[model samples]
Target: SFSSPSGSTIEAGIAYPISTGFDPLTSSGASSMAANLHIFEGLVDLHPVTRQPYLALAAKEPEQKDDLTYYISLREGAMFHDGSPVTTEDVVYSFERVLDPAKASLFAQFIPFIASVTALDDNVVEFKLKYPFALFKERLTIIKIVPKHIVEAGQSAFDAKPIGSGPYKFVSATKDDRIVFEANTVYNGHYPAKVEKMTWFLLSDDAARVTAQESGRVQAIESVPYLDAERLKRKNNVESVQSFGLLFLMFNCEKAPFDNPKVRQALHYALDKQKLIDIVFLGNAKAATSYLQDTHPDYVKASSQYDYDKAKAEKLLAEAGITNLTFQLLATDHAWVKECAPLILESWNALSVVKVTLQHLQSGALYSAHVDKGAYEVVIAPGDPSVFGNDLDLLLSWWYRGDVWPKRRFRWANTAEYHEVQKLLDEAIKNPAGSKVAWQKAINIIAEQVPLYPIIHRKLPTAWNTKKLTDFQPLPTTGLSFLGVGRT
Candidate 1:
């Protein structure tokens, strides 16, 4: 029943659950963002495997006439899946909608450098910047172009059934079941769909994903359980790629004790990251030395290292006048996250000064019910902004620069340090020569503050059957992309 008319389909087992609605402007969940890569087009897009930016809808790279001005020409003969021409008007609307304050786009925070996007002509667009941003070219991938007419007609309907000018067209999607796509016969891009149809099974369960792949129900499976990597390698091509994705610890700064930076620092110090990585993840992860992974090009060893130190943790808590710290530690229900929860509680409990009650819930519930409402004390969850773009500035801005995270989620936006972090980022973007120093300072401050910090940067394990598919490369970030892959 899942097979296409040609009796062949690219069936994939996806491990991440769909936690957010599919609006490219606001979508943050792994599954939704991955699907958008196929269903939408940005003027520039990062290659799914190489992470290199390429012209997607733009005729060529944006031409910069001045530090704060750029001109982009739309690709000729480009048309949306709904058979609408890809015009400069559509490009302008795509950006304006995200920049609209009433829209409350998750991506708006990423592009504060932009002052305005205007349609210069039927085929040309102009970008006016607030300041000279060094990473402007790669950052254009943040806004996926949307049809102005379709979205304005009814955003809810557009969210449910999106139309774009990409290699594939969105066909059908059922939450927790499957997301289906068909090749866009009208696509006029560089990478056309190699398969006629693709079906992604939303398998959040670790065993179910492995079973689907082992049983030949799917050609590839992502988020391969660490325990099953060796076993699955016997029959499939298994590769564990180092990812910027991390299991992070976030505290509700509005809550007492947690409001103190010292208290937050103490909790980070108490974590036995190596032990958790070894026991729960089978040593397939690296304890975070800094905000960025060691593999990252801009990695700088943080000033405040969270090496396991029971004495230091206790001393910091005592200095902050915090004792008998008992709080519920909320965690995501993903298989790996669930496994790390108990070990984290165990570490905290071992301190004798602290006792934590563990509650593992779905990512959506954990945030909506607790984190968003300021009902959470501490939370351990996975996040990868690298899904959008992997530049150090982009990664940092997703958490620190974003109002939704620091202000609403962590409750740290009101602080002097928050303002300082913001200033540093702004200066870094404007001053390209001194950018590294500014970035490092911001990272050091984040490390010291611990509003929300990484516990471990994990290795994403992926398994695929080479006999079933051709030229498939496992992603370093979350979610799977079959951009150029084909059935064998």
Candidate 2:
């Protein structure tokens, strides 16, 4: 039974491990997020393939009353998986739970402009904003509507097996085993499940995932190995999409030589981005020209460019009056990152004046043992806020505005450049018409400062059996989506 069960089951191979519970409010692991997309419904949910917002639980498009007020009506017959009716109270409770300071929901950081969410009527919910946010509609997707009664009654049970009004219902999940789901028979929405059941195999090993796809044990796989794309394409549909996911170099700005922007810029210039792309990624990545990938609509060419110039790197270090600088390069142990770490060490070691020692550790321990304790001199890591939303404001806020990143991880909160970025982002959020200019300015500043900037935006490779599944498209970010996909 390795293969799917006729047309009734859709099985996928997931690359990341399932490390968190199923609570959408507090869960952030890649596996949890992917599963949540099917088991839950937001007021406005992003299309699984297109990433565009559509009214999900909401009856229709929200009506804007003024610069600050909006009204959203619930769908006529939306019902949770447990057969409970979806109420305006549920919507308000979802927002309030995230907003509650005591709950300390991670998603609360994304929607600070919300003044209040209140039930206007039995079927209608009203929102008042602290300021006019242009991405308000799209941003509502962060707060997945939860059953107030179920959560209030048994929070732990609800966390273990989530109930929602989406097209799928959660059946069971086992850590390091698999997650199972069945179609919500009561679902009345734009897209219904095309298969009777869905199962995602928790395959973190590269060889196991590739074998699953090649042997027809699974219909699709996410995070396809770069070296195996062309080979897999012989029998399946393999797509390489430029995503916001990136490998970035973060500096501990509190230190001496590292604090200087020129030193940080020198390190970037010393590394040959194209060589790393060729050797490690097999030419599947794009060197970051701006803060965002060129594929992004909001992308603007940054003023500061690091185009592999050894002389420029030497000159910057010389100007800073640093001759024999040495630091340890702390990195995560992901397969791709391990490939890049040695190449990066080689690049910096080429400079006779600089010495780098590489230290690789698991992501969790790397942060808790070093970054959180401020024990590291430099860090090379991966990040993708696009998992939340793709807007420039949201992306920037993930690193800059958040205390977890700017203050603790990189320690750049006290710098003057940090405050300037905060002010510019605040201005952009209030003025819908003039956000691009403000956003561009902010990008240019961070590009020059290089507190934590990306080296390359990697292309996510997804492989699927074209004959077995229909309407399956790759995501620009992490995780797999089977929303409108089905066995043929």
Candidate 3:
């Protein structure tokens, strides 16, 4: 059994039902919450330490030829939640369905490298890449295979209830505030979870969650606010786990003012990232220099210069010939963002070139306007792990060209320099691993330009009761799993 740092424990050798209100695909928070269990598998899974894709469902790693095609062999006797055996057909169907334009899967934007997925046999699957990607195998780890029969029915129905060969099976999900899963006892695989059931209580308020934890009402919790991390750490039977992720101000480059690259750079230079991290994250965060976190393999040491340089910012704005510029910055009405917005506004106000307007929209509305519609000039959001693959191609495509999100979050066409840099990134992803020099050259270019200004690498602090659990470790990516956890 595994226990949270807060001492919330799950009984060993039993399946525990976990609960949360995150709807799949609809909400990033929900998707992230569910990804902890529903999306990833155990055998052919990501390495716990390196975060690299390794053999999870496969019997062994695939063989590559000409850097274009990868051939994989499935482990014998692998079975889905329904007790039917897994096959290559499922892999092909899963990839195709995700890529189907009608489905509108977010994964489509990330997996452009794959030209087609073909089934060679019952145990064999072959991926033909549009271009050679060195980290192709790593990309496969995130693509949880669903049964062909299920996907063939339709994308909407499949996403609502996905069936995989993982250790748990989806039971039911409610829009208001609950997601249920049943243990797959037929899952004859490694890392068998001990919990019989797991439930995630959907509480929007951090303070309320703390109250629940302290009152012995909840067993495990996530997103422990930094203000309470220390208090929880001192608790009698609680523990905490932290990892690197980032929270940043995303610009909607398609709009005016921000539509100008100089304006965006000006904003980047104007704000004090260090001060913001300290104030917002309470010193529990690391100042981020690059979009990729320190944990990423290709991370290059960057100059620790994430400071507010108002003079330089004003100069850049002057060069852009903008004497007066005013625009709205979008952020959630969550207490954290509301608290930080004024400080951020004040910092930008110090720069005579730009006048900032703070628009504190509700979380649901903000998601629609900024993330979905790309309707805002600037929006504060998190830079999630590029789970599709480790390549910068995905990043550039999404953020640089504004192709990732339909409304063009970043207008690359307006910036020639950004366009050139994006071109280099694209080439690097298409090239083979042997072409290391080219990839390094591309990275060096990106590191110098500061394409996406970052704030801090955020970590999730989790708490649970230890008395009822053992062998529990918080996953780098958020999610609750019953596979390896059990009662003491």
Candidate 4:
């Protein structure tokens, strides 16, 4: 049957197959979610309210005494999962591995921000930043520490059995089924868990999972479908939880027709976003006015806010000299997207000048082809605002330079303009003190240019058997943490 660890009693480190594996170098969600809690401790962790990274494993805040050097010290008594004491050497080794070209770490792209990483003593590790990066601490939170002994042996061994100082210890795993872990009593931290064992079951079928909950077979579930949310709340002993994210229509602007800014703006103006939100999302999501969500504190401006004028759309198309434009709109065969695509097709068809062919493909197949081969003109996709650092550079880099995904996915041929924008973004990252203003300007420029159309921001919904679980709060950033949960 389908189930997950109870939300309140025990913190269950969950894994999803969105990337390759639980290994930090290969996986995305599995790596980030697991490492943040279990394996590696960051130099600092984000303060809950400020969302700023504060000292964690580090002894004190990083001090830049000179333009070329920054000094740091490690917290005393810090240890790895194997009980070996953590030292400046381990920190240096971990950073070196990430920067090593041979490793091809996903994080290698950001390493240029640092000129050098050095260990001065058992408790001292320092960094020489190329420039003052205000967001440096926040960026450090994403790097998971790897034991020097394991990493020096080979990358393969570390990938197989990652050993870090976290609240949980790795037990075992089976592909596409579940990864099992046990509480680490040796953990030296503030929140010691009470739950004995935690398992993350990977159940793909939403109905099957809901049935399991109804029959009292499973304790919890994740990624609950919107249609089942209200019904689950009505059940005798079930509860529902949700958080903010967004789903939207993504266009391959590098492709013809869409390459024109007018055509892209026309597509944005053509659709009835509110109707799509109502029907496809079941009104569970917030309409996205800009690439940034309203939930984010620093939303400087909103671009095209729900302007559904079919005549205006037609005029824009005619102005672009594109009267009978035919392009393919690709979407996942996921239940929601399948229901949403036809509405979009019908809305655009109302313009009479535009012709859109809806292509529904399996989620995995579609994502693989889209990212690796650049197959469709436009695709229905979702982006997590939290994961991208909420910075314009990160967003533009992901869309234009293929920093986050494969390069083939970014087929934008205008290399000169792409380079110009990237240079500005790099400068912003290097000098993060001016980041707020720099990023705001960058986003404004990108929005005005219409590189990618911002659609609706999605909300995440989850359901569980409340009778058997307690303390099930959904976090805006982390989704769900079973660490504070207990079985009733």
Candidate 5:
């Protein structure tokens, strides 16, 4: 029933079902994002296998006039899945919508320097910037190029008939069952869909995902339960890759008690991170000391690292005069959280005057209902912002640089470090020559402040039927990529 009408069908399983609409600009769901990545195309695309940015819809390299402006040329004869030729008008429209403040796209914050996008000619689009910025070319890799007519027709249009100039075209999507796609016959790009057809299972239950793969109901599965990795590999080929994905320990910084940094420090020192890994994850994770992974190229070793220091925690709690400091810890319904939360509650309770009661909810409701509203005392949730980029500036900007993310999510705004970050990022962007010093300064301050610090970076486990799929490699971050994979 899941097989596509087209030949050479490929099936995949995802952990979460998408509640959000299929609109790429507005989606926060993992499954929706994964599907869109396959179905969408931009002027520039990240090479799925190498994770390097390269020209896609654009034919030639972008030509820059100065630090602020650029001229982009499109790949001749390139066409959207709907058969409309990719045009400079389409390019300008795509950008103007994202750069619009009212649109509230996750990508809008990264392109604050953009002043305007104009169609210079049939094949040429011009980008004018408000300021001299270093990451101008790199940030363009994000803004997915949408056709003018479909996107302007609004949500219902894209929702009913999602269109893009990419290798894969959406076939059909159902909430809980699966999303289907077929190779775009009109696609003209470097990375064409290797398989003729694709199907993604929107399986929220962990057992349902594992069972589907084991029973040959699906050929590939993402987010394999850590406990089942070794056992699952005995039948299907399973590879667990180290990821920068983190399960964070976030405090309600705007609220009292947690607003106190000493209180935050005390709580950090109270928990045994290594113990959390051993007991909860069974050695399927890495202990994180700072935001950027230890392996990240621009990683600045944080000076003020939090270790398990009970005496320090107790002393800090004493100095703060925080007696009966209690919290209701909120965690998401991800399977690992089910095991990790009890361990964390016990750890905090073991410390003096710290009482924590646990509440669990689905990941979607947990964020919208509690975390996003700042309605919780504390939160332990999983996140992987590495989907955007893994560099220091990009990684930090996931929360720090974004207008909505910092103020709404982490509540980093009322702090000196937040202001310092804005200054440093601006300074870095201004130089256009060099600004590593400014970026490093900002990173150091963020490390010191401990805004949304990581408890552990998870190792992603993916299983695929080796007998059916060839060249199956696991993605280092969220969602699976099958760019070069093929059916045997």
Candidate 6:
């Protein structure tokens, strides 16, 4: 079932079709990100398995003269796919462009710590921060290195035919059909592509994807069907790997009843998380006690856990002096979440005093049109902050900080607890030593307040042919990984 003209190519399948163009600064959709991971290389790369950060383009790990400034050495002889060396000026330009505010990088909010970036010599680069930010190395993975001269000359050209110092170079990208890339021959990094060429098909249908893998139309596929998990297990490479990715219950705190913490907690208590996981997910998920998964190093056991309690929900609603509660829940077409939406409606509708309607939109429209605009009153969608890194400080801020998520979408700024969390975050930012304590305090506030909390940590399923490829491994998060895989 392979489509590559050559024997050395590894044909693969991704879950979603590309919605945004392949500009590293703006692409946040899964299809865009999956393609970006191959076509672009970050200054630092986070190990997929261990979640540790290491230099990917830099010569060695950076040196911190103080808490606010870091010195990075460029890797010697590192060449882009376009036959250009990855120089210090390129690294500096990448930083400057992202921070320009006009670039509109989704990552710019994450890297606000960079006050200025300068190349000391042809080999060394310096990053001076606005504050004594901790977790800088881990956060730096968000900034992928780009060619300064190329991007400066014509961004439209770069967007169409992107070039980076990654393992693979962009060959072609059809809007929603497929994306093709070839391995950079002269690349020297931790993960040089093992296969000579990679062809990724944008197969959005579940049956089509499974059948593709089974019939050998493709060697591997993502978003493996839960019902097909056992059947896929007959093959050696199919796996349902546990991931930090979570399905969350979010609220638009700008609205009436949802603005109250008791109302939010009460709604959380109404659902049987176990039943949701077992029946809807088909046991391919774990109940999330907090935002951080139990497996993460920075995992914090939340101070309050909401068990399924309809009485508590009713009591809280009564205390709020409300009756016959009605609201519309918003969710995306993430396969499992789509399946789980009816179960969600069934569970919440079962509440004697509650009436609910489920609205599902495609991923790009749901996020770009509704969620970012804070239009929905209640939402249940899947998200994984661990895609960046697993630090508690970074993870919490990614969703709750003033500059990023909380105020923009969730409207969580209404709560006094958010202010308290803000102070804790600032304290953590100012002094890296107290990050643990600060994060503990922050998580405690979130668990206690329950503005918008995670419901379950999903276990992802991926199917691949064992005999055709060796060293094939599926990522804990979404999409397929072929970093060290090679054709047999």
- Model 4's alpha-carbon lDDT is 0.63
lDDT value, candidate 5, whole model: 0.79
lDDT of 3 at 229: 70
- Score residue 448 of candidate 2 by CA lDDT: 99
lDDT of 3 at 194: 52
Q: Which regions of candidate 3 deviate over 4 angstroms?
A: 1-43, 47-50, 150-161, 174-178, 215-218, 236-245, 250-263, 311-326, 332-334, 352-354, 362-379, 385-396, 401-407, 432-451, 481-483
Total clashes for model 2: 0
Better of 3 and 4 by TM-score: 4
RMSD of 1: 3.8
Lowest lDDT block of 10, candidate 2? 1-10
The models' CA-based lDDT, in order, is 0.89, 0.91, 0.61, 0.63, 0.79, 0.81
Q: How well is each residue in 1-488 modelled by candidate 1, as lDDT tens digits?
A: 02122545799999877787777977888899999989898999998777889999999888998888999999999999999899999999999988999999878877888999999899989999988998988888889999989888989888888888898999999989999999987888887888888999999888899999999999999988878898898989999888898999998888998999999998888888889989988877899999998877788899989999989999999999876898899998987788899998988998868878998899899999999888989999998888878787899988887667999999999898889999998889885898999999999999999899999998888899999888899988888989878877
| TM-scores of the candidates in the order shown | 0.88, 0.95, 0.80, 0.83, 0.89, 0.90
lDDT, residue 132, candidate 2: 90
Candidate order by decreasing lDDT: 2, 1, 6, 5, 4, 3
lDDT leader: 2
Q: Which residue pairs clash in candidate 2?
A: none
**Candidate that would win on TM-score:** 2
Compose the digit string of candidate 3's lDDT tens values, residues 1-488: 33222222231111122332222222245334354444335335665434555566788878786668888888788887767788888777767766779867665666678998888887888889887776676666546677777656774576666677776566666543555555666665565535555555555566877776666666656566677777766652443334445566666656676666677777777878778767877765666656556665666655434457889888888988998888777777756667678888899888876778888888778876565665667777555554334544554345554454423554434566666655666666665653445545544554444435556676556666675456555544454444466655
Specify the poorest-scoring 10-residue window by lDDT in model 1: 1-10
lDDT for predicted candidate 2 compared with the true structure: 0.91
lDDT of model 1 at position 360: 87
**Model 2 Cα displacement at 345 (Å)?**
1.0
Clashing pairs in 5: 59-75
For model 4, how does the per-residue alpha-carbon lDDT over 1-488 read when each residue is reduced to its tens digit?
Answer: 11233343332322244345455555466333643455556676543323456566777777767755778787777777777877787888778777878878676664457877888877777798777665666667656666787666776666666676655666766666666666666665543444657666665566776666566665666566677777778763333322224566666767778777788778878888888878887776666566676666667665445477788888888899985888788878766668878998898777777777888888788878764577778887655545524445545565645444423554544545555556666667766576767666666656655555466666656566666666555444533455445577
| Candidate 5: tens digits of C-alpha lDDT, residues 1-488 | 12223558899998877677666577657677667778887777765444577888888888887767888899998988889888888888888888777878877765677899999989889988887776766777678888788777776669556788888898898878888888887777776787788989887788988999999999999988878888788889987677878888887788888777788888888888889888887787877766766655566667667788888999989888988887799999876898899888998999878888999889889889887888877889887877765555677677677556678876878788789889887788786555777777776776667667887888778899999987778877778787667777
